[PDB]
């Protein structure tokens, strides 16, 4: 119903955004074992 | 030196972020494992 499919999209949305984050953290990581 | 710290503070606010968001994916799969 409604309120299932609510929060069906949230759950998609915030999985993305912590994807996203996880990206950006590799990416930072990287680039911290590249600096003195 | 200065290039280190401050990917180390972006470290820091990515991973905030991340855990704030990792206990509301938690809330939320709870919320329908619960239907």
Same mark, same amino acid.
């Given at each position: 119903? %409604?309120?299932?499919?609510?929060?069906?999209?949230? =759950?998609?949305?915030?999985?993305?955004?912590?994807?996203?984050?996880?990206?950006?953290?590799?990416?930072?990581?990287?680039? =911290?074992?590249?600096? %003195?």
């Amino acid at each position: 119903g %409604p309120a299932m499919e609510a929060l069906e999209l949230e =759950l998609e949305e915030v999985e993305s955004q912590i994807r996203a984050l996880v990206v950006r953290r590799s990416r930072l990581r990287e680039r =911290l074992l590249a600096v %003195p």
